[PDB]
């Protein structure tokens, strides 16, 4: 009882009925697969930022506000 083996007929119609839209592009996609050393350095820079940010950046903001 030989039958049909494999065809791709009437497949593009099934695909285009729902759509072949591109994947959802969003900001801050992901951080997976990134170098572990680079990720560790980024975490350290993010967690040590508020130590010196809230003072020197505030002083510079006051200075630029006095400038303009």
């Amino acid at each position: 009882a030989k039958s049909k083996n494999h065809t791709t007929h009437n497949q593009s119609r099934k695909w285009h009925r729902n759509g072949i839209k591109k994947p959802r592009s969003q900001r801050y996609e992901s951080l997976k697969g990134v170098d572990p050393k680079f990720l560790r350095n980024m975490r350290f820079a993010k967690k040590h930022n508020k130590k010196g940010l809230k003072k020197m950046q505030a002083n510079n903001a006051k200075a630029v506000s006095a400038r303009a």
């Binding site: 695909w15 994947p23 997976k32 990134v34």
Partner: protein, 157 residues
């Protein structure tokens, strides 16, 4: 039944061009690749360490990871049903920059320069592109020379 394989059917795709065999040129190594730049993929046969799959040949994608001898590229591979954003780790031997992004950057620089320069003069410059418009009415010239008559040649075997 078609003998699916990792390098099936790349006899002419992964081969080096004619009169271009030998060691790799050193200019392709000194190129800088940062995160977020749009690059292209072209499989090279000189090295076989980090070559991509035959389905990503000629594909353009952005870089999301950088390492010592390779780069991570997010490629939009169209599977039968939809498109998947796949992360691929390929060495720098098979990657080159995309001039489309460079042309776009040059165009946006020209635009933000032209507008900044014309704001003072008050001239509303048309920096937005357009399609090729139909040519306007022009005046040809014959300078007294009569147009040459064209006649179809008789058939000859």
């Amino acid at each position: 039944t078609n003998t699916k394989g990792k390098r099936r059917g790349t006899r002419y795709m992964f081969s080096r061009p004619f009169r271009k065999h030998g060691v790799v040129p050193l200019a392709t190594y000194m190129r800088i690749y940062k995160k977020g730049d749009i690059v292209d993929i072209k499989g090279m046969g000189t090295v076989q360490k980090g070559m991509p799959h035959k389905c990503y040949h000629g594909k353009t994608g952005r870089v999301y990871n950088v390492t010592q001898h390779a780069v991570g590229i997010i490629v939009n591979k169209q599977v039968k049903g939809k498109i998947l954003a796949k992360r691929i780790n390929v060495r720098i031997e098979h990657i080159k920059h995309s001039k489309s992004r460079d042309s776009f950057l040059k165009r946006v620089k020209e635009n933000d320069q032209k507008k900044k320069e014309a704001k003072e003069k008050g001239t509303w410059v048309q920096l937005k592109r357009h399609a090729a418009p139909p040519r306007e009415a022009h005046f040809v010239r014959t300078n007294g020379k009569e147009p040459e008559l064209l006649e179809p040649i008789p058939y000859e075997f």
